[PDB]
């Protein structure tokens, strides 16, 4: 039974944007949760449905590892039952969520002198997302009463905005990578266990 591919998920070179967060399925391997927890780099490690020490023994059906880069101040919104731009329009965690949220500062990778503006987030949306929705559409918004009809006027905003990551921005505005592990702990044939 081979080791789980956590190294790829946590040491990937380039992370995805917020609005198009990549989901990596994991299954049929021996998970090693001790390694990740023991490391000290992870600024915020929060497990919701379970306890972090229990993880070494539980057996799950399969687990999803999401990844994206968000601003430091908005990390809180990645949690069940909160709101904001990220929760409402980008990435909504369902209530009764069961998994672990992992985040760490990445100012030495995702921020370069002159600013890094390649990480985008959705700002204007008609309605909130359903849990784990991944709306990648770039439909022209309409904040004015007049119909926009696909012409980007002064009230026909493009619904994506790019973060501005200066190398010397405050800790609040520095880019934090986020990995969310979601364990759907059904009683279907267990595929991922800890030694």
């Amino acid at each position, epitope marked *: 039974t081979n080791l789980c591919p956590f190294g790829e998920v946590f040491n990937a070179t380039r992370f995805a944007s917020v609005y198009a967060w990549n989901r990596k399925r994991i299954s049929n391997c021996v998970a090693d949760y001790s390694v990740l927890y023991n490391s000290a780099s992870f600024s915020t490690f929060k497990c919701y449905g379970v306890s972090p020490t229990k993880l070494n023994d539980l057996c799950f059906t399969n687990v999803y590892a999401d990844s994206f880069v968000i601003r430091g101040d908005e990390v809180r919104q990645i949690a069940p039952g909160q709101t904001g731009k990220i929760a409402d329009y980008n990435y909504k965690l369902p209530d009764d969520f069961t998994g672990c949220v992992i985040a760490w500062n990445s100012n030495n990778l995702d921020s370069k002198v*002159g*600013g890094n*503006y*390649n990480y*985008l987030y959705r700002l204007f949306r008609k309605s909130n997302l359903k849990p784990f929705e991944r709306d990648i559409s*770039t439909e022209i918004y309409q904040a004015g009463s007049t119909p926009c009809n696909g*012409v*980007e*006027g*002064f009230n026909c*905003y*493009f619904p*994506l*905005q*790019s973060y*501005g990551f200066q190398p010397t921005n405050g800790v609040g505005y520095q880019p934090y990578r986020v990995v969310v592990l979601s364990f759907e702990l059904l009683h279907a044939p267990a595929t991922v266990c800890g030694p």
Partner: antibody
Amino acid sequence: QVQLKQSGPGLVAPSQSLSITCTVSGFSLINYAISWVRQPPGKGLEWLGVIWTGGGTNYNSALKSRLSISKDNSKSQVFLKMNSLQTDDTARYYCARKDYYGRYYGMDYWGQGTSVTVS
Amino acid sequence: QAVVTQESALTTSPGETVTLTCRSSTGAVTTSNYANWVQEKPDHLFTGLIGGTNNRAPGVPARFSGSLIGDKAALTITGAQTEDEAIYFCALWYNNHWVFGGGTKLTVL
């Protein structure tokens, strides 16, 4: 710091087409729009056209539709192209930033200007 | 429907405020036609002063202030001689395009 650069020797011969480039730092092309204006020597400036935040253009009405503006978000560059030039077009051209998402609904910042002279 | 006109002649002694009016060809300027004020340095340097008919650009001194004080758009300034020798142009957003006025030459004292 927000900054606008545009560069080119410029000088043109009649009936050919030459293009100018605008290079930007300190702001992202997704959060703003870029407008181009043209300044014949000693006269009032006229507005050529705008490239909106994510593509899609407007142009000056009577100005020739045989011209286009284009951009590259990756390198933070903007290009104006005209496909045929006439001697009245000899002018200084300027890049400009339009901040219509937030507070300042006009041309927030302006470039250093490039001379384009035909003959 | 594109003609916009300015006086193009101005003089304010230091400390005294003046108003320059830019007027459209659609009657009194609407709020929709957002007003813009730009400043011309004598070395071919440009900057933006007022947008949206009320908003100062970031980093412009609070001494500068404007609005639709009269039915046509206009701008006002308290007199600071050294840094206010400049040309100023008014711009109006018609829904189809932006139109720029001829511009007004300010000659303080």
